Amino acid sequence: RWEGGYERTWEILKEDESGSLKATIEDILFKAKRKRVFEHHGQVRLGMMRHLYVVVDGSRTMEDQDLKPNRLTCTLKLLEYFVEEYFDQNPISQIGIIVTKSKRAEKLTELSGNPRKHITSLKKAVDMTCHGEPSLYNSLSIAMQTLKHMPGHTSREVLIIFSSLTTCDPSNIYDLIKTLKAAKIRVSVIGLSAEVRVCTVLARETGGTYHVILDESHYKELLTHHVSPPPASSSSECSLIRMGFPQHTIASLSDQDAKPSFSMAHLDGNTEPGLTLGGYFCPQCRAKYCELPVECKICGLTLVSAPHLARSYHHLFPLDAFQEIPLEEYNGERFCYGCQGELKDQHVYVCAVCQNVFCVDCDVFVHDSLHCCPGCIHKIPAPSG
């Protein structure tokens, strides 16, 4: 019965085209198993200066293995990567690390952009018991009251790491729809390997996007989907003003070494508990402390540092696309317009405008690293006007 039936599963899958060329097409189906969802982007409108809120379910669902030795191990490790790749892409923003554990919510790291503080917090978050049940109501309470004091010229989005369990919290979180719909705060959850309808209704009543974790690769995809600053609901803001352009200071300008250290509890700046020698300078406090392209606590305006953060999204929107042809128009001497090679896996990648020939390793290098076709350069800037 089943001793045969356990091996009726194996026997055919083992078997293939016999005689010659055996265990060959089994490898071909594995390549045919590949090539999942690429981009499907092309959007406009919103996404600028997010104010994210990490919300972590700490529950007994973590004790199931399912991808890793812990579901936090699946979670927490790639959050650091998600932190770094965020600060890579979006430095104009800041993130609220808030942890739910034992039916409450602990705002673990404040809404800020200092990566080491966030990452070591995750390195502190390693040895978490995740005792108790999730409570989103305490999480939204922090999320309200913090972002309540943020301007309406702020992007208001929440990223919830939920372990798909029972949403164990009172006090009419169904009525928190109209609370937060009016409060123009977006809330995005993704479910860990299952679905919560109420939370699925929550996000579809939000405009925040809900998903379910499939796999570790798939876990990365939706992170990567939420790296990009999304086009949230209309009528948020237009502008955001008193973007402080700073100065770097060399502390060697006119008076050479007239100050042994530029942090002595009286100097304009010197914000954090450490010694400094003068590296930076804000306009409004005239605040000189450790360099930070974010904001301050006395002038209270945004320490904008343009080549970093006014450059990051500044080309992250205006992209175009390529096309693929299997044909052989042999442009070059059977070459690439970029790296100049050939393999011909029938993916001759042609630009939409300048129409230049590329490979996967030239398409990926654009569509992950270069983000534009340089074949448009020499082609845009020469007749540009």
Partner 1 sequence: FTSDAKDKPIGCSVAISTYSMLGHTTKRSWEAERVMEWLKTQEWGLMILDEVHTIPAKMFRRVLTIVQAHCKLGLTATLVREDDKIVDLNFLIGPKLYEANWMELQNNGYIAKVQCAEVWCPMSPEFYREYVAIKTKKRILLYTMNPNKFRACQFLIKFHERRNDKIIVFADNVFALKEYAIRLNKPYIYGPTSQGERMQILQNFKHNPKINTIFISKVGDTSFDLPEANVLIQISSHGGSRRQEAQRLGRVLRAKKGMVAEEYNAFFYSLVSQDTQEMAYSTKRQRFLVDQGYSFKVITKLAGMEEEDLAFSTKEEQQQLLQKVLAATDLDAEEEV
- DSSP assignment of 242-295 equals -B---EE--S-SSSTT-SS-S-SSSSSB--SSS-----EE-SSS--BSS--SS-
Residues binding Zn ion: number (CB under 5 A): 14
Structure tokens of 34? 């590949």
Under the criterion CB under 8 A, does residue 123 sit at the interface with partner 1? Answer: no
Under the criterion CB under 8 A, does residue 127 sit at the interface with partner 1? Answer: yes
CB of 358 to Zn ion, least distance (A): 4
Q: CB-wise, 317 or 335, nearer to Zn ion?
A: 335
Residues 70-99 binding partner 1 (CB under 8 A) are 70, 73
Residue closest to 157 by CA, chosen among 75, 72, 246, 228: 228
CB of 215 to partner 1, least distance (A): 16
Count of Cβ atoms closer than 10 Å to residue 240 Cβ:
15
Under the criterion CB under 8 A, does residue 145 sit at the interface with partner 1? Answer: no
Among the candidate windows 39-47, 245-253, 297-305, 321-329, which touches Zn ion by CB under 5 A?
Answer: 297-305
DSSP label at 385? -
Measured between alpha carbons, how far is 218 from 333 in angstroms, rounded to an integer? 40
When binding is defined by CB under 5 A, the residue of 91, 113, 229, 375 that contacts Zn ion is 375
Under the criterion CB under 8 A, does residue 65 sit at the interface with partner 1? Answer: yes
Residue closest to 44 by CA, chosen among 263, 313, 308: 313
Among the candidate windows 92-100, 192-200, 255-263, 335-343, which touches Zn ion by CB under 5 A?
Answer: 335-343
Q: CB-wise, 3 or 368, nearer to partner 1?
A: 3
Q: Which strand (E) or helix (H) includes residue 58?
A: strand 51-58
Q: How far is CA 272 from the centre of its chain?
A: 28
Under the criterion CB under 8 A, does residue 120 sit at the interface with partner 1? Answer: no
Under the criterion CB under 8 A, does residue 10 sit at the interface with partner 1? Answer: no
Among the candidate windows 68-76, 90-98, 249-257, 328-336, which touches partner 1 by CB under 8 A?
Answer: 68-76
Question: 273, 290 in Cβ contact below 8 A?
Answer: no
Under the criterion CB under 8 A, does residue 5 sit at the interface with partner 1? Answer: no
Question: 249, 241 in Cβ contact below 8 A?
Answer: no
Under the criterion CB under 5 A, does residue 281 sit at the interface with Zn ion? Answer: no
Q: How far is CA 279 from the centre of its chain?
A: 30
Among the candidate windows 65-73, 190-198, 209-217, 248-256, which touches partner 1 by CB under 8 A?
Answer: 65-73
End-to-end Cα distance, the chain? 78
Q: CB-wise, 123 or 242, nearer to partner 1?
A: 123
Mutual orientation of helices 71-89 and 115-124 as an angle, nearest 10°? 180
CB of 126 to partner 1, least distance (A): 6
When binding is defined by CB under 8 A, the residue of 28, 126, 360, 377 that contacts partner 1 is 126
Find which of Zn ion, partner 1, none residue 70 binds, CB within 5 to 8 Å per kind.
partner 1
Measured between alpha carbons, how far is 180 from 198 in angstroms, rounded to an integer? 15
Which residues lie closer than 8 Å to 207 by C-beta, 6 or more apart? 186, 232, 233
- Longest Cα–Cα distance in the chain: 92
Under the criterion CB under 5 A, does residue 299 sit at the interface with Zn ion? Answer: yes
Q: CB-wise, 69 or 300, nearer to partner 1?
A: 69
CA dist 239 → 152, 236, 293 (Å): 10, 10, 19
Under the criterion CB under 5 A, does residue 351 sit at the interface with Zn ion? Answer: yes
When binding is defined by CB under 8 A, the residue of 28, 39, 69, 341 that contacts partner 1 is 69
CB of 67 to partner 1, least distance (A): 11
Under the criterion CB under 5 A, does residue 130 sit at the interface with Zn ion? Answer: no
Under the criterion CB under 5 A, does residue 366 sit at the interface with Zn ion? Answer: no
Q: CB-wise, 1 or 33, nearer to partner 1?
A: 1
Q: CB-wise, 130 or 143, nearer to partner 1?
A: 130
Helices and strands per DSSP (H, E), number in the chain: 12, 11
Residues lying near Zn ion in the complex (CB under 5 A): 284-285, 299, 336, 338-339, 351, 354, 358-359, 362, 373, 375-376
Residues lying near partner 1 in the complex (CB under 8 A): 65, 69-70, 73, 126-127
